[PDB]
Amino acid sequence: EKTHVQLSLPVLQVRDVLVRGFGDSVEEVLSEARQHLKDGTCGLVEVEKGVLPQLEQPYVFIKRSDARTAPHGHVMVELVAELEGIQYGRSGETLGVLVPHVGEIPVAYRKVLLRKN
Ligand SMILES: Nc1nc(-c2ccc(O)cc2)cs1
């Protein structure tokens, strides 16, 4: 497994998302997020007012992991989970919140260089 992988994630509007989180514990949501990333079944919801209360906790965020540079168009990112106000991981700015993708029509694709850790 290389340390990072280039992915193009479908960006979903929150009201379209059918499965509003990955599971019921921090460890489960991180595990499931990683599996859906592997399978090409992970979407991204950009955070704006009203978005997080419409999604299910624990949340999985992708956050920016370096400023140096975004290789080949793909922002370098890592996963950080949140439950009841506590975060598991420390990283940079949030690009969005990951959710299962089950065929919803995206509004854009977001290119990222994902750290697998
Ligand atoms: N070849 C590819 N590997 C992945 C991947 C692999 C491992 C993870 O933990 C998360 C994503 C996505 S695409």
mmCIF file with all atom_site columns, C-alpha atoms in Angstrom, residues 26-88:
data_model
loop_
_atom_site.group_PDB
_atom_site.id
_atom_site.type_symbol
_atom_site.label_atom_id
_atom_site.label_alt_id
_atom_site.label_comp_id
_atom_site.label_asym_id
_atom_site.label_entity_id
_atom_site.label_seq_id
_atom_site.pdbx_PDB_ins_code
_atom_site.Cartn_x
_atom_site.Cartn_y
_atom_site.Cartn_z
_atom_site.occupancy
_atom_site.B_iso_or_equiv
_atom_site.pdbx_formal_charge
_atom_site.auth_seq_id
_atom_site.auth_comp_id
_atom_site.auth_asym_id
_atom_site.auth_atom_id
_atom_site.pdbx_PDB_model_num
ATOM 1  C CA . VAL A 1 26 ? -14.914 6.624  15.795 1.00 0.00 ? 26 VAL A CA 1
ATOM 2  C CA . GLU A 1 27 ? -13.040 3.455  14.949 1.00 0.00 ? 27 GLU A CA 1
ATOM 3  C CA . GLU A 1 28 ? -15.886 2.155  12.806 1.00 0.00 ? 28 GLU A CA 1
ATOM 4  C CA . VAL A 1 29 ? -16.382 5.342  10.799 1.00 0.00 ? 29 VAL A CA 1
ATOM 5  C CA . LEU A 1 30 ? -12.675 5.643  10.044 1.00 0.00 ? 30 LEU A CA 1
ATOM 6  C CA . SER A 1 31 ? -12.534 1.998  8.989  1.00 0.00 ? 31 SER A CA 1
ATOM 7  C CA . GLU A 1 32 ? -15.620 2.213  6.834  1.00 0.00 ? 32 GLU A CA 1
ATOM 8  C CA . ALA A 1 33 ? -14.532 5.509  5.277  1.00 0.00 ? 33 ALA A CA 1
ATOM 9  C CA . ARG A 1 34 ? -11.248 3.926  4.293  1.00 0.00 ? 34 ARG A CA 1
ATOM 10 C CA . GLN A 1 35 ? -12.994 0.887  2.811  1.00 0.00 ? 35 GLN A CA 1
ATOM 11 C CA . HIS A 1 36 ? -15.397 3.043  0.786  1.00 0.00 ? 36 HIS A CA 1
ATOM 12 C CA . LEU A 1 37 ? -12.456 5.132  -0.428 1.00 0.00 ? 37 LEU A CA 1
ATOM 13 C CA . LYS A 1 38 ? -10.778 1.886  -1.597 1.00 0.00 ? 38 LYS A CA 1
ATOM 14 C CA . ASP A 1 39 ? -13.989 0.784  -3.357 1.00 0.00 ? 39 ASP A CA 1
ATOM 15 C CA . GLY A 1 40 ? -14.754 4.106  -5.026 1.00 0.00 ? 40 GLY A CA 1
ATOM 16 C CA . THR A 1 41 ? -17.958 4.477  -3.043 1.00 0.00 ? 41 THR A CA 1
ATOM 17 C CA . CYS A 1 42 ? -17.130 7.531  -0.915 1.00 0.00 ? 42 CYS A CA 1
ATOM 18 C CA . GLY A 1 43 ? -18.526 11.007 -1.437 1.00 0.00 ? 43 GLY A CA 1
ATOM 19 C CA . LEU A 1 44 ? -17.694 14.401 -0.005 1.00 0.00 ? 44 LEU A CA 1
ATOM 20 C CA . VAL A 1 45 ? -20.032 17.014 1.447  1.00 0.00 ? 45 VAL A CA 1
ATOM 21 C CA . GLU A 1 46 ? -18.672 20.530 1.747  1.00 0.00 ? 46 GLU A CA 1
ATOM 22 C CA . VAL A 1 47 ? -19.353 22.026 5.168  1.00 0.00 ? 47 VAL A CA 1
ATOM 23 C CA . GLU A 1 48 ? -21.563 25.098 5.346  1.00 0.00 ? 48 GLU A CA 1
ATOM 24 C CA . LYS A 1 49 ? -24.031 26.270 7.943  1.00 0.00 ? 49 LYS A CA 1
ATOM 25 C CA . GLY A 1 50 ? -26.688 23.615 8.491  1.00 0.00 ? 50 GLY A CA 1
ATOM 26 C CA . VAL A 1 51 ? -24.698 20.744 6.988  1.00 0.00 ? 51 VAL A CA 1
ATOM 27 C CA . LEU A 1 52 ? -23.328 18.915 10.021 1.00 0.00 ? 52 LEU A CA 1
ATOM 28 C CA . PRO A 1 53 ? -26.695 18.753 11.864 1.00 0.00 ? 53 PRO A CA 1
ATOM 29 C CA . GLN A 1 54 ? -28.120 17.031 8.789  1.00 0.00 ? 54 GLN A CA 1
ATOM 30 C CA . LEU A 1 55 ? -25.403 14.329 8.913  1.00 0.00 ? 55 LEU A CA 1
ATOM 31 C CA . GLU A 1 56 ? -24.816 11.559 11.432 1.00 0.00 ? 56 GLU A CA 1
ATOM 32 C CA . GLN A 1 57 ? -22.089 11.530 14.035 1.00 0.00 ? 57 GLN A CA 1
ATOM 33 C CA . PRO A 1 58 ? -19.359 10.389 14.381 1.00 0.00 ? 58 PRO A CA 1
ATOM 34 C CA . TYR A 1 59 ? -18.243 12.478 11.411 1.00 0.00 ? 59 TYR A CA 1
ATOM 35 C CA . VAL A 1 60 ? -15.266 11.706 9.179  1.00 0.00 ? 60 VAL A CA 1
ATOM 36 C CA . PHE A 1 61 ? -13.533 14.783 7.826  1.00 0.00 ? 61 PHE A CA 1
ATOM 37 C CA . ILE A 1 62 ? -10.823 15.102 5.243  1.00 0.00 ? 62 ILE A CA 1
ATOM 38 C CA . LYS A 1 63 ? -8.413  17.812 6.327  1.00 0.00 ? 63 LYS A CA 1
ATOM 39 C CA . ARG A 1 64 ? -5.474  19.389 4.589  1.00 0.00 ? 64 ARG A CA 1
ATOM 40 C CA . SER A 1 65 ? -2.195  17.799 5.709  1.00 0.00 ? 65 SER A CA 1
ATOM 41 C CA . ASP A 1 66 ? 0.438   20.084 4.208  1.00 0.00 ? 66 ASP A CA 1
ATOM 42 C CA . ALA A 1 67 ? 0.682   23.530 2.671  1.00 0.00 ? 67 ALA A CA 1
ATOM 43 C CA . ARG A 1 68 ? 3.983   22.999 0.879  1.00 0.00 ? 68 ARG A CA 1
ATOM 44 C CA . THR A 1 69 ? 2.275   21.819 -2.286 1.00 0.00 ? 69 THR A CA 1
ATOM 45 C CA . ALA A 1 70 ? -0.729  20.036 -3.866 1.00 0.00 ? 70 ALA A CA 1
ATOM 46 C CA . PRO A 1 71 ? 0.813   17.479 -6.252 1.00 0.00 ? 71 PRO A CA 1
ATOM 47 C CA . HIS A 1 72 ? -0.645  17.259 -9.768 1.00 0.00 ? 72 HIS A CA 1
ATOM 48 C CA . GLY A 1 73 ? -3.883  19.100 -8.807 1.00 0.00 ? 73 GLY A CA 1
ATOM 49 C CA . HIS A 1 74 ? -4.645  16.909 -5.768 1.00 0.00 ? 74 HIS A CA 1
ATOM 50 C CA . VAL A 1 75 ? -4.693  18.512 -2.299 1.00 0.00 ? 75 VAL A CA 1
ATOM 51 C CA . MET A 1 76 ? -2.912  16.330 0.250  1.00 0.00 ? 76 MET A CA 1
ATOM 52 C CA . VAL A 1 77 ? -5.403  15.271 2.924  1.00 0.00 ? 77 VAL A CA 1
ATOM 53 C CA . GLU A 1 78 ? -5.867  12.957 5.881  1.00 0.00 ? 78 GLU A CA 1
ATOM 54 C CA . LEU A 1 79 ? -8.863  11.587 7.774  1.00 0.00 ? 79 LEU A CA 1
ATOM 55 C CA . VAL A 1 80 ? -9.972  12.945 11.158 1.00 0.00 ? 80 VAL A CA 1
ATOM 56 C CA . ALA A 1 81 ? -13.058 11.773 13.022 1.00 0.00 ? 81 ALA A CA 1
ATOM 57 C CA . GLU A 1 82 ? -15.241 13.767 15.406 1.00 0.00 ? 82 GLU A CA 1
ATOM 58 C CA . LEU A 1 83 ? -17.663 12.625 18.078 1.00 0.00 ? 83 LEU A CA 1
ATOM 59 C CA . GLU A 1 84 ? -19.435 14.775 20.653 1.00 0.00 ? 84 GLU A CA 1
ATOM 60 C CA . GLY A 1 85 ? -17.040 17.641 20.109 1.00 0.00 ? 85 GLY A CA 1
ATOM 61 C CA . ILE A 1 86 ? -13.813 15.629 20.400 1.00 0.00 ? 86 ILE A CA 1
ATOM 62 C CA . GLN A 1 87 ? -11.539 15.050 17.400 1.00 0.00 ? 87 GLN A CA 1
ATOM 63 C CA . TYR A 1 88 ? -9.404  11.984 16.766 1.00 0.00 ? 88 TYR A CA 1
#
